[PDB]
Symmetry: C2
Subunit: 434 residues, 2 copies
């Protein structure tokens, strides 16, 4: 595998190569990617989407937008530091080809900013509501008119794969979606495989899949340009992760681990009495305890803890990446960067506490139950309208929600998934009379 | 004026100088500033604050957070391009001192990200609600126990000055607030003067003021370190704007001009029939009309128009800055970058259309009226509780809203101003029984 190819500036449709040495550094393709996401309608919709806790007006809770912002800031810092060490290890990359360390921060920052852009509302219940609808619900009907992989895309519908669709969807007047650089699309793709075969190993890259059948041709072009290593020689295609995808994943791991905990303390789902017990190993050498004791607000004490722990995990993740860089470059690294952490046990303890106190709180459970009905209802109305587009009621459903059979079902799923929490509830409420 | 001093890396409390040449480029002080704002509680609260249109669940409206994100992306691009041209004009800045063009993008990006962080809820009615409360309302009482400037801070309370307070406020365990680099604080300060004298000229830098009496000592340290030019030799202090403040302002001007228009079309406050008539001069040479005509959604047509016009105004603003760079460096530039635009008349037409159709819409008027009562109510309850902290009711008001006389009144104003739209309405509602 070669870093020169992995850092591709190609955009979908390019008829001629884009050499890094010929880029205007004030218009660097990788940094244009970041700005294109900031201004995109899919990214704006993250402002009104729950990350974990249902939104309120009585308290601040992280939305998908604020979470994605934080992951891109952590990812930019990981890419910057890993970039400098990579340029020191492969100095031809800078001296010949012209890559700079901020290039790597820009790729990770942009892929991180977009990493959750395709996720359905109401969390992973959203994903399973969609999947079960086609497994056993009304969607079962279509099984026999679909290939095994087309159907697998639906019964195991994945927000990561919908994110890739969102980023590249071609519509009239706008071919290629956001047209992000192939390097950013590679750093985005943490599961570079189709929906089948299902979990062919215990590798984290095989836990899910990363693109739908409708996007397969695009990711084939991406993987070829990047020179990603094959992980399958059958007609079920699969590739080793772009190395920078490991940094997007780590930024994400770091943020939801530490920041879910922070939110849980500020919302009162986790007793503040637990904050230091769970963070002491992550912060013990850098914490200024006198400063911590002088802070008079809970939210200030816990944000100080969060900033210390995130700093700790960033430095360690940079070191883990470089110690396993050749294994990662050869596609033989079998785990995540955080799985190798010396704080693995503490991370696991924090995550389990959050699962117990936040994910299993009444409000999060209530939301996931409500989500299952809201999304199943919307999917039933979309699909009935698709099957009999002639009735008056179905023409209304089309006007309200959406003004090849697989291409239609995958598009219905993508459109339901990119609904904000509010719009989905309002449409649900009107379909049901309220 | 010297660019070497204007690019200061000093943080409040520094006992030793910070040379740019000795910075770790993966931990550049200016880029740390950006990340410190992203993670700060004041910036997070912008997620739940209206920019112009009241928030809804039926439609996407820009919050203060999304607006600030967009301004920092436009500002980063302005600073990058202006930086490269400045480094080409003063090559000693890079070859001797070590400044890079991305330094300038980082300063403008961070000051832009924070530029609205202190603004009170419900818009400029929020500011005038606060001002009138002390001019003629309950706050009149204190006039005689306050200096003319201390009082002027209250009756002309300014969100820009509250933003500076927010960014630097010292509390137990956290001296200096976010401790941003003095260069970022200089780019943030577009009105580098105290509340008095009031509008001593028609210069845009004298239209308001930029720091409260409680922050005067800090900005004196900032202006000295930066080497800003004096604009007053009386005991009323005042300085010429940091040159990069002109780029923060332009990024802001560009975004609320074009993006308010975009939001007004998508919300149906402005007829879509007007979109091309008002944008044609801004986009006429770069628009692909066939592409525009092929787009099937309004929101896509208008986002294409917005991206073309923003691109147009960025390039022009970079050129205006460099053509007036010595006047700006000498503090003799008398206007904003956008005031010099060749599209001045079109910008004015767009702004007036937005005022007529959005700012004077029923919903925005309803919000500003409601805001005046909500904030006046909260200020009355805070100030009565301050005057008689012994009564049971006032002890409750203290527990609900806040668990030297000027220092108390300026702190009450800052605390009311940093309330989200929802928390302010809830507290208002409980004080009034609902
Ligand atoms: Mn995430
Ligand atoms: Mn603004």
């Amino acid at each position: 595998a070669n870093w020169e190819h992995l850092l591709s500036l190609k955009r979908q449709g390019d008829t001629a190569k884009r050499l890094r040495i010929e880029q205007d550094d004030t218009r660097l393709g990788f940094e244009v990617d970041y700005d294109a996401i900031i201004f995109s309608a899919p990214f704006r919709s993250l402002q009104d989407k729950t990350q974990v806790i249902p939104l309120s007006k009585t308290d601040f809770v992280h939305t998908r937008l604020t979470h994605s912002l934080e992951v891109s800031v952590v990812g930019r810092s990981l890419g910057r530091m890993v970039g400098k060490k990579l340029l020191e290890k492969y100095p031809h990359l800078e001296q010949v080809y012209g890559y700079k360390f901020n290039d790597f921060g820009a790729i990770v920052a942009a892929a991180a900013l977009a990493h959750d852009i395709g996720n359905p509302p109401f969390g992973h219940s959203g994903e399973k509501a969609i999947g079960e609808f086609f497994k056993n619900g009304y969607g079962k009907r279509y099984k026999d008119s679909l290939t095994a992989k087309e159907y697998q895309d639906l019964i195991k519908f994945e927000g990561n794969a919908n994110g890739f669709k969102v980023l590249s969807q071609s519509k009239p007047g706008a071919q290629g979606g956001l047209r992000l650089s192939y390097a950013t699309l590679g750093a985005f793709m943490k599961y570079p495989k189709e929906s089948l075969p299902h979990k062919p190993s215990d590798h984290i890259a095989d836990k899910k899949y990363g693109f739908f059948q409708s996007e397969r041709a695009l990711f084939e072009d991406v993987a070829q340009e990047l020179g990603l290593l094959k992980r399958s020689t059958t007609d079920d295609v699969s590739w080793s992760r772009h190395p920078l995808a490991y940094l997007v994943e780590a930024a994400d791991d770091i943020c939801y681990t530490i920041i879910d905990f922070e939110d849980g303390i500020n919302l009162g789902l986790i007793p503040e009495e637990y904050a230091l017990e769970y963070m002491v190993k992550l912060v013990g050498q850098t914490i200024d305890r006198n400063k911590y004791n002088a802070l008079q607000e809970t939210s200030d004490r816990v944000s100080y803890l969060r900033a210390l722990a995130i700093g700790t995990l960033i430095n360690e993740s940079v070191d883990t990446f470089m110690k396993y860089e050749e294994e990662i470059l050869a596609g033989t690294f079998d785990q995540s960067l955080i799985d190798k952490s010396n704080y693995q046990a503490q991370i696991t303890d924090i995550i389990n506490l959050s699962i117990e106190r936040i994910y299993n709180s009444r409000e999060v459970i209530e939301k996931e139950i409500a989500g299952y009905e809201i999304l199943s209802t919307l999917l039933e109305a979309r699909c009935r309208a698709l099957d009999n587009n002639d009735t008056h009621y179905n023409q209304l459903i089309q006007q309200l929600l959406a003004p090849s059979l697989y291409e239609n079902l995958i598009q219905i799923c993508a459109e339901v998934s990119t609904m904000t929490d509010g719009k989905a509830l309002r449409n649900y409420k009107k379909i049901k009379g309220l």
